[PDB]
Design a protein around this ligand. Structure first.
Ligand SMILES: CCCCC/C=C\C/C=C\CCCCCCCC(=O)O
Ligand SMILES: CCCCC/C=C\C/C=C\CCCCCCCC(=O)O
Ligand SMILES: *[C@@H]1O[C@H](CO)[C@@H](O)[C@H](O)[C@H]1NC(C)=O
Ligand SMILES: *[C@@H]1O[C@H](CO)[C@@H](O)[C@H](O)[C@H]1NC(C)=O
Lengths: 50, 50
């Protein structure tokens, strides 16, 4: 909350307000870089080049 | 996918991932130009000047 801010942050399968009350089993992080018009394509059930 | 890119693309009545497996009956295309704050108004169940 002091330094880093996100333009989009959307989660599926769990509400955000409960993220501090849980514990997570098999955590993986995928990283890449896209353009601005492709950020909407990183979602379930989407079409496009990405 | 080579030349033209869309900032918003949202469809209603059919999932996007099935658009290559179907055939369409009565296809019409409406064209116009708006400002940036009015693109959100082109949707079902919306209010505003547009
Ligand atoms: C101009 C005539 C078009 C006729 C189309 C007929 C039926 C609709 C089916 C597919 C059109 C979807 C276009 C979306 C292009 C991909 C968007 C993206 O880059 O993610
Ligand atoms: C300042 C006092 C407002 C009191 C309003 C009372 C009830 C709410 C009902 C209508 C307010 C909706 C305002 C939206 C303006 C249109 C937005 C647009 O341009 O699309
Ligand atoms: C938050 O960031 C500022 C900027 O450097 C820093 O001075 C401050 O100590 C930070 N706060 C904490 C709790 O680290
Ligand atoms: C895609 O666009 C580039 C830019 O002009 C062009 O060189 C290339 O041949 C195009 N690809 C196809 C398959 O048309």
């Amino acid at each position: 909350y002091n330094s880093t801010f996100f333009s989009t942050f959307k989660c599926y399968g769990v509400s955000a307000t409960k993220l501090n009350d849980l514990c997570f089993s098999n955590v993986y992080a995928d990283s890449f870089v896209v353009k601005g018009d492709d950020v909407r394509q990183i979602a379930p059930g989407q079409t496009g080049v990405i």
